[model samples]
Target: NTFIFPATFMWGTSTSSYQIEGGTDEGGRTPSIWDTFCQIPGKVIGGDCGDVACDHFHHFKEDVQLMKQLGFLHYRFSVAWPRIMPAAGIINEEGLLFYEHLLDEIELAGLIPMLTLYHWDLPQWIEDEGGWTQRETIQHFKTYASVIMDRFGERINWWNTINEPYCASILGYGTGEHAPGHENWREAFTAAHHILMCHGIASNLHKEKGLTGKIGITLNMEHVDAASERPEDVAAAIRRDGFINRWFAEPLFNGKYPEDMVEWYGTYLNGLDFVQPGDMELIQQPGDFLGINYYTRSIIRSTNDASLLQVEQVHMEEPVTDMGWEIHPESFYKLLTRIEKDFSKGLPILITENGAAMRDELVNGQIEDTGRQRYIEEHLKACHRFIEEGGQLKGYFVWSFLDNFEWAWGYSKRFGIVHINYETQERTPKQSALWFKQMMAKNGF
Candidate 1:
């Protein structure tokens, strides 16, 4: 059963510079925070580095051909910040040429070029100067963004200012599980605020540059599952959701931070100085679309600790992914409905990143991943139901085009729909890849 989408349904795939583009030292790409982070021993599994991923920097033409054969309409790729500006005081000419070639090839091949300004690749030069914690980084970000917009303002069709700033600020700085790993919980609060501020400034700059592109932000959100009916667990779930979801969404949509965020960050009254007048307005400057990346939900319970406004994440027992994330398709539906009920406006909503990484096996000349196929189909069904009911849904782009350096987890987790033969650098279409292609052909089912 195939249902149709709006005439504008865009079938697309996404990639990041460090994750797929493996010319780490090329085109004036000096050391980025990710570059330095990978060098730290024991920081990554197998001490793996993204220095040589799928070599997409060289194989992008081939990759584009692959997407074209698969019937993709758009390609959403991130522009590496470190690649563009290798130094704090310098902008790299060669880096611009690299993307120039990519965009040109995409245009020639009849695909829309969807560009993201930043995707977790903060230049090391800035990361050392207190990174996003320092207000000056926002100016640097705005400058970098303006330069990109000025060059490709007319060529680039769609602009996503920043890709998942929460990950850069929260996971990178808040929890320290990712790059530029810092364990200070409080620092993450200020870092997230600064990221939004940077996005706000960049969005206004993109419009001010006389570009015809529609600009917006991409954020990763999770639906919190309350552990119990008790007021404590329910309250904890609300707080956690407000922090992870509305922390980015509400400020952009409603033009003010959530009330709970104000209470949560009450201890950091000193950081309030970072908030400048018109910052929220600049950040909330209306966008043509909103991109949301949803993977999994968390079950939350309140903790007894008073020093830290405590909340404990209760992991669900299930056949988890290689990343140890439990698969809960129902939670995914609940998340979409919740966004529609409380957060999403009529602005077209795109499920920019939604896929799973499983312990897949290649057997008998055929790589069969039954679990992954189920995951995509089930989630699409949830999405289709949401669309059926008045959701301003537009498109759904899966997490990856291919599996490359999976960051800290390295290649241990396979989230790509296609299987990569790291030994020969060949991509094998998995069962899920075929299934997803067919689903895209159907548009909805």
Candidate 2:
């Protein structure tokens, strides 16, 4: 069955500064935690770094032209924090000028600009001062947000305060899987709180500045289910959901953390001292809409062994992406419906990041990435199904506009419709990009 989308439904692609914008040292830019993290031996596969990522820094004009050619109505990208503020208590005009030019190009292309303030690229200076764990980081983020708003608030309308606090906090601090890696649950939760505070504060800043655009936070959330009918496995699903989805959703929507998660975490941390008065109130802003970054669902199986969350994720027998994530479009529908019913209510929702990392091969000077194309088509079908069922889904943006640095996995995983040649800084639109162009033009498959 052919699916259709509303004519006003926005179609776009998302990219982050640290992932695509190279020129790490130029334009008065300083190091972010990712830069330092990449230098550590074995921290990133292939020892790859963003030092020359897509070189989009110098080629943004061409990139914008390419995006315009791709039939995208909006362009969602993040501003580099370290670039804007090279050091503490300092604002770099040169750094601001780069984005000013980038914005000009985006506007010239007749595309809406959805600006994200942060996407896991914390300034090294901030990390040196205890990073997000310290309560003081909230104010530091405020200063940075104020500067960003004062400079570019008028030109851009859509604002995303932060992207994926779970990855920024739990993966970075608790699991030691991302940048500024640390293995402390206390630090992780504290950082998570501070990150949410930044979102609330930034959302307020957008309104206080009278910017005529909507603002929200983007979360990396997933749909989860119990592995089997066993009561233990069923309970494990709730615990996993609490850890992954409800931890941030509760504070954003309900003005509090999940009670079960709070009590469970207290068992390990001794006491939940990081959360203070008014913090929950601050996080309850909820912004204008909710932006979800979904890829796959998780099946939880209870375990008796000592492990984080006392659960293990059970993989499904399904086609998998290059990242090894299962392709489950049905779960995508469930996730959208659940978020709308439980958290978003009637607020408009955006699939801010949803695409797969597929094994791509460049043959005869063309990339026939049919697998990635099918992946996006199936997910979009799920999105269309949700909207048809009275869900207030608004827009969808592919996970990445171009493949660049893939973080700890480095250049090993490709999740972009446009493939990047690392050595030559060449960008070749894959078959999926062409397919997406046709879909966007017709507003459906």
Candidate 3:
């Protein structure tokens, strides 16, 4: 594949509100579920919280400037819900002003902003009621979109309704790993339905009200590889696929949940009563683009574990990231091609968040993060292959723009091209950042 993209190709980095912005109580911001979740004992590794993470709220201008210097022409960041509305039906003007100022700086730096409305930072007040599990929360989300669109619609031409609906709905509610943690299959499925409905309703509102831009939702999906050629292993991969991948993609692209999943879930679900008429139609509204956030692959084999899918992951001999995610660039390439064939239907695909975590070894004022650099280089080649083979792939955004507070894992994992000294809040560009800068300047490797 050639090391080039069309002139219109976009290059950027992504950061969520809670992970980077640390004005937890300032600017009229109230508690998000993450804020509360961080306070619980032994939840996040290292018992970390985002109260003062990177202090990006105070140093956004410098961060924006850093990105510009890194040759990034695009930036994808989120606005915290609690920052805008501390409570239900409550509008925080100061909160709006903070994002307004931050957005102005980004625009001034000559960068296009893709603003994410919800990035797992739900207003604590909403969680107090029932969160995404209840349909009433959908009304609250619409009100959120209505308010923020009026505030920011003119500035940003791209908007992401939600980041990683699976993590927002399933991981947070199913595995009990993320914020507002609740471990139950029934609650997880219900929450996912409402979240997708919100995505549809919000996208519809953006179009109807003319929000002045393209809109899409970001989904964190994986490339599922069967651990073995055995029929049982292959079937296990398919079953696991329906649980993690199809549960979200099927509803969004095809207007309905997978039938096999529906039947399988019925075994453990208390009731499918949470699903309402016209829900699928609402969730199926096609948007301007589809955001696919792929990291690694899942190699599954048949297992007798007491899990709903009856599948367990198989270990591979491949290299792994600091998070223990397999470093399979081939799988990454397979995912892009498969997305084109199975899900996207020729819709423009953006690799909204694709990057890996690595232990940073900052030696003598220089962060020699060659592992992360190679990771980016390989993924970029995978992206290039997609474009070379007639795929409608458009852009790429690295998982993080800064080393901020990672959810659940806390600050232990470093995924940023720019390293952050947690103590002094100093920013240092890693080896990858420099490599990326040159690539962006040349428009390719």
Q: Top model by lDDT, which number?
A: 2
Residue 401: error of model 1 in Å? 0.9
| Alpha-carbon TM-score of each model against the true structure | 0.95, 0.98, 0.98
What local lDDT does model 3 show for residue 326? Answer: 90
| Whole-model lDDT per candidate | 0.81, 0.91, 0.89
Clashing residue pairs found in predicted model 1:
none
- State in Å the error of residue 362, model 3: 1.4
Tell me which of candidates 1 and 3 scores higher on lDDT: 3
Q: What is the model-wide C-alpha lDDT for candidate 1?
A: 0.81
Worst 10 residues of 3 by lDDT: 266-275
Candidate 1: tens digits of C-alpha lDDT, residues 176-268: 767898877667777887898877887778767878877778888887889999999998898888878987888888888887777876866
lDDT by residue (tens digit), candidate 2, 1-445: 9899987898899999999999999989999999999988888998888888889999999999999998988999999999989998789999999999999999999989999999999999999999999999889899999999999888877898899999999999998889899988889988999999999889778878888888999998999989999999999999999998999999999998898898888855557678788888989987888989999999899998766799999986678998878899999999999999899989999889999999889998788999999999999999999999999999999989999799999988999999998778899999999999988888888
Cα-based lDDT at residue 58, candidate 3: 97
How does candidate 3 fare on TM-score?
A: 0.98
Clashing pairs in 2: none
Model 2 residue 289 lDDT?
85
Model 3, residue 118: what's the lDDT?
Answer: 90
User: Would you list the clashing residue pairs of candidate 3?
Assistant: none
